Amino acid sequence: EYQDDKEFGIGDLVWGKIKGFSWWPAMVVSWKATSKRQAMPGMRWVQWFGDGKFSEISADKLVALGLFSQHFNLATFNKLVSYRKAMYHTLEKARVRAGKTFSSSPGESLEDQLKPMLEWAHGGFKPTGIEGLKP
Numbered sequence: 001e002y003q004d005d006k007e008f009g010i011g012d013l014v015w016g017k018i019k020g021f022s023w024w025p026a027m028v029v030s031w032k033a034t035s036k037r038q039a040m041p042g043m044r045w046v047q048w049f050g051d052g053k054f055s056e057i058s059a060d061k062l063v064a065l066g067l068f069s070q071h072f073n074l075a076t077f078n079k080l081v082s083y084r085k086a087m088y089h090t091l092e093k094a095r096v097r098a099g100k101t102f103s104s105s106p107g108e109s110l111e112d113q114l115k116p117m118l119e120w121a122h123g124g125f126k127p128t129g130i131e132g133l134k135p
Contacts, residue, residue, distance in 0.1 A: 001030055006042050006059035011135025013065035013094060016046055016057050023063070023071040024083070025049040025090035049093070050086030065090065066130030068121045084110055091117040098125060098132030 002009055008028050015023040026046040031038045034045050034054040043058050063071060076083045088110045095102055100120055104113050125132055 001038065002028075002044060002059075004042055004059075008044055008059050008062060008064075009135070013090065013097075013133050014046060014062045015065060015067070015071040016048075016055065016062050018048065018055060022073060022076055025065060025086055026055070027093065028062075029054070048086065049090040050082055064130065064133075065094070066125070066133055068125070072118075072122070084114065087118070088114055091121055094121070094125070094133055097134065098128040100125070100128070100132070 008014060010028055010030050012028040014026055014028060016026050018024050026048045028044050029047045031045050033047065034056075036045070036054070036056070039045050039056050042060070043056050044062065045054055045056055046062070047054050072087075073083075077087065091114070094100070095117065102113070102116055102120075120126070124130075
C-alpha cells in the first residue's frame with residue numbers, strides 16, 4: 001500500500017487542506033480504515049484529527065506535520081473549538097511518539113493542556129526534533 005515513490009506512509013502525521021483553504025492536522029491511514037477502496041495511485045487516505053473523518057488526498061497536496069509553525073493557524077485556533085480539539089489530539093499523538101512528557105489534572109481545559117504542547121511543537125519538538133514524530 002502506497003508503494004509509489006511518493007511521500008508519506010501509514011501512520012505519518014501530516015497537514016492537509018479541507019474546510020476551506022485551511023490546513024488541518026491528520027494522519028495517513030490504510031484504506032482498510034476508511035470503508036472505501038484503496039487510494040488511487042499517488043494518493044493517500046488520511047484521517048483528520050478531531051472529527052476522525054477520512055479524505056483521499058494526493059501525496060503532493062500533503063505536508064509533514066513537522067512543518068508545524070508553517071501550517072498552524074493561530075487565528076483559526078483562537079476562533080474554533082474544533083481546531084483546538086484537533087490540535088490537542090494531534091499533539092497528544094505527537095508527544096506519545098516522541099516520548100515527550102506533559103502533565104495535567106482531571107478536568108484541566110484542553111486550551112490549558114495545549115499551552116505547553118504548542119510551545120514544544122512551535123519550538124521544533126525538542127529534543128527529538130521532527131524525527132520523534134515518525135510512526
